[PDB]
Amino acid sequence: SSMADFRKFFAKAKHIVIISGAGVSAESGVPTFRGAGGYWRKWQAQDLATPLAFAHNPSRVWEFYHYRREVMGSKEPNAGHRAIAECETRLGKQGRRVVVITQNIDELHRKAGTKNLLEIHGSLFKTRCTSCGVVAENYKSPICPALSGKGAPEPGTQDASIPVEKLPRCEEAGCGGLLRPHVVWFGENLDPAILEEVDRELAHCDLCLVVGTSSVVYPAAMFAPQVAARGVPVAEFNTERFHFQGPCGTTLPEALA
Ligand SMILES: [Zn+2]
């Protein structure tokens, strides 16, 4: 039904799951690399976010992720992210739970103040050593000196073609292994531990929100339907149970007041 009917459910909901999609990041001007304007140079983003592309050209893969890390400098969380964060803070002092399950890798939910965050696809600001497996936070600009001035999005740009030795290297003593971005690539599974946390949130929630994506599309498809099958209401906020059409920065400040 209406927004007034959603607010009734929202006022009584004690454990809210928020499934956050690409729409939420696109509203902050964050480049998504899906759709028609989801291109970097002469390749598809799907072409680069793969174990195969990193094995054959780690320099080109690192140039792509270096760009994505650098564009975040000028990006700020929108009214959607803020309303989500303030909602968690406020409801937490009332002994009620708000959890954000996101596929976004830009950390804007983290900058807005969301604490209960599940980043199922990893983060741009995390590296993983291909030799020792250590996962680490990395906000350094540029991530390595050979990547200084590299990663121009424009097609025609020559490959930086950095030797593997000069790409980001693990700083753990005696390792020096090749680092990769700590993100889920095409053909890779989600971390089972992260999946267990997700499963647990979905099974205990009394309200579920799907924002800047829909329930009939991945990853919200692996999550939101089994919530609706338990009887629990699902509200979708998108540019396309309850459904609310429009930007998240418009509908969420209101819904989550
Ligand atoms: Zn290492």
Q: Does the CA dihedral 27-33-35-39 come out positive or negative?
A: positive
Helices (H) and strands (E) in the chain, counts: 9, 11
Residue ranges for the known binding site for Zn(2+) are 129, 132, 170, 175
Rounded to an integer, what distance in angstroms lies between the CA atom of residue 82 and that of residue 160?
A: 38
Report how many domains make up the chain: 2
* Resolution, expressed in angstroms to one decimal: 2.2
Angle at 128 between CA 116 and CA 199, to 5 degrees: 35
* DSSP letter (8 states) at residue 61: H
Tokens of residue 61, six digits: 């893969």
Range of the domain at 253: 1-30+77-121+189-257
Experimental method: X-ray
Q: DSSP letter at 203?
A: H
Q: Do residue 93 and residue 142 come from a single domain?
A: no
Q: Which residues of 143-158 are buried (b: 16+ CB within 10 A; e: fewer)?
A: bbebbeebbeeeeeee
From CA 167, how far away is CA 32, in angstroms rounded? 24
4 and 44, same domain (yes or no): no
Instruction: Give the separation between CA 168 and CA 112, rounded to whole angstroms.
Output: 28
Q: 135 and 67 in one domain?
A: yes
The rounded Å distance from CA 69 to ligand 1 centre is 21
- Cβ burial of 182 (10 Å; 0-12, 13-18, 19+) is buried
Q: Which residues are annotated as a binding site?
A: 21-40, 65, 68, 103-106, 129, 132, 170, 175, 212-214, 238-240, 248
How far away, in angstroms, is 141 Cα from ligand 1 center? 20
CATH number, residue 174: 3.30.1600.10
CATH number at residue 116: 3.40.50.1220
Torsion of CA 53, 59, 62, 66, to 10 degrees: -140
Q: Which residues are catalytic?
A: 121
Task: Output the CA–CA distances (angstroms, integers) from residue 156 to 36, 42, 49, 69, 233, in the order listed.
Answer: 18, 8, 20, 21, 49
Co-location of 136 and 214 in the same domain: no
Cβ-contact 121, 38 below 8 angstroms? no
11: CB partners within 8 A, 6+ apart: none
Tell me if 245 sits within 8 A of 235, measured CB to CB: no
Instruction: Give the Å distance between the CA of 170 and the centre of ligand 1.
Output: 5
